[PDB]
């Protein structure tokens, strides 16, 4: 039974989505209970035909930088996803709203953990396709970040993608112009948007013309090394963008804080 295994609390988050706070009765494990309407499901996969989101979550459900799927149920008109819920958390979007531009030491720690998480997805055959501050939780006690909402993701492939369901203002210019992209280089573009967002306090681009324009104006004081990493991630030509390895070897990325150090210095 579904209503017998979990105590169901209130709605979580900040729109047209249905995710409830919950606790697992077996052991009081905090959980997030996500309801997905069958009629709204974009892509389907198979294990038993299930939403692709379930397939992707199972593939990455090993490592703590990605949300863990604990279980799922099918219902007449919906699927229900039981996700392991960290607490206390705030998502990175609200975190940046309240604190403004992050100090580079903090953005370095956050960005590094996002890189490790995305690398984990790719190693598991999963492309998230909606990397953004709204899809990142911060465990305020442990200083650990969690990538959430794989509802726009896809199996990772090396050929061209011609569909996209993520966030337009994080999507790369080859998607804007030609409605095609490759997975890794598109991911790196969104990581550039994300890094700018962290060190400047908001995303750089709001309109298609800015996205394809290939000019990055810095509205806050940002180190030359960080600016260079950001501009590299936002190279207009996909093959000019860095690989994950090049990102993590960039001089701006050296001497990262551990998660616990991050929490003690910046979150406690």
């Amino acid at each position: 039974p579904l209503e017998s295994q979990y105590q169901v609390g209130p709605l979580l988050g900040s729109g047209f989505g249905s995710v409830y706070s919950g606790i697992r009765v077996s052991d009081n494990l905090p959980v997030a209970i996500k309801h997905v309407e069958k009629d709204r499901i974009s892509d389907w996969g198979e294990l038993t035909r299930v939403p692709m989101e379930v397939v992707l979550l199972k593939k990455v459900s090993s490592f703590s930088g990605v949300i863990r799927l604990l279980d799922w149920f099918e219902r007449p008109d919906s699927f229900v996803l039981i996700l392991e819920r960290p607490e206390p958390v705030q998502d990175l979007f609200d975190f940046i709203t309240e604190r403004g531009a992050l100090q580079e030491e903090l953005a370095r720690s956050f960005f590094w953990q996002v890189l490790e998480a995305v690398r984990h997805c790719h190693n598991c055959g999963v492309l998230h396709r909606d990397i953004k501050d709204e899809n990142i939780l911060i465990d305020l006690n442990r200083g650990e970040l969690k990538l959430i909402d794989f509802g726009s993701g896809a199996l990772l492939k090396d050929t061209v993608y011609t569909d996209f369901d993520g966030t337009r203002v994080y999507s790369p210019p080859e998607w804007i112009r030609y409605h095609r992209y490759h997975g890794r280089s598109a991911a790196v573009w969104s990581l550039g948007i994300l890094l700018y967002d962290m060190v400047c306090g908001d995303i750089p681009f709001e309109h298609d013309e800015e996205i394809i324009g290939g000019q990055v104006f810095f509205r806050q004081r940002v180190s030359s090394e960080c600016q260079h990493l950001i501009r590299w991630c936002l190279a207009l030509r996909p093959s000019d963008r860095p690989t994950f390895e090049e990102i993590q070897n960039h001089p701006w990325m050296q001497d990262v804080l551990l998660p616990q150090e991050t929490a003690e210095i910046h979150l406690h």
Partner: peptide
């Protein structure tokens, strides 16, 4: 300036 969320889709 106005910072805002952006829904997926």
């Amino acid at each position: 300036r106005k910072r805002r969320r952006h829904p997926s889709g």
